[PDB]
């Protein structure tokens, strides 16, 4: 499971000098959220590839992620 070290650094990517401070009981909650996030992305991507139509891409994920962009 994603080490607490990485997680705090990733969550802090958008600001500050020093990383954010997070209470101890919250870190494993975010670790679990992360596991859920990627499990949803993948399983939904798989389901999408089946509805339309063994190998997933740009496009199975694109199709599953909402109207969020974070690029363009």
């Amino acid at each position: 499971m994603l080490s607490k070290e990485a997680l705090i650094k990733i969550l802090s990517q958008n600001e500050g000098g020093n990383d954010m401070k997070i209470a101890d009981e919250v870190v494993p909650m975010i670790q679990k959220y992360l596991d859920i996030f990627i499990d949803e992305a993948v399983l939904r991507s798989l389901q999408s590839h089946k509805d339309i139509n063994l190998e997933l891409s740009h496009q199975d994920l694109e199709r599953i992620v909402g109207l969020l962009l974070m690029d363009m």
Partner: protein, 87 residues
């Protein structure tokens, strides 16, 4: 600091890969390099958006440390996640 983005993503890929192989029953279905890349960026960016929101919510409450009520507020519209994330 684009160098930090690469170092942290490499870390992220370790768990991402674990999870890809997990609900795969350990190697059964293929993923393209684009799909791996996209998933990684998506995971990395979403964690960044959430962290930023967690920090703002903590500060809104006049605290320097992110606590459970911040996460719960972030997850306010997903009562199922709130539970899952604590269980």
């Amino acid at each position: 600091d684009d160098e930090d983005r690469a170092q942290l993503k490499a870390r992220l890929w370790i768990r991402v890969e674990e999870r890809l192989q997990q609900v795969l029953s350990s190697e059964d279905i293929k993923y393209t390099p684009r799909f791996i890349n996209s998933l990684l960026e998506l995971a990395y960016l979403q964690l960044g958006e959430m962290g930023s929101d967690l920090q703002a919510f903590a500060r809104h409450a006049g605290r320097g440390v992110v606590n459970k009520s911040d996460l719960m507020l972030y997850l306010r519209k997903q009562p199922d996640l709130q539970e899952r994330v604590t269980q």
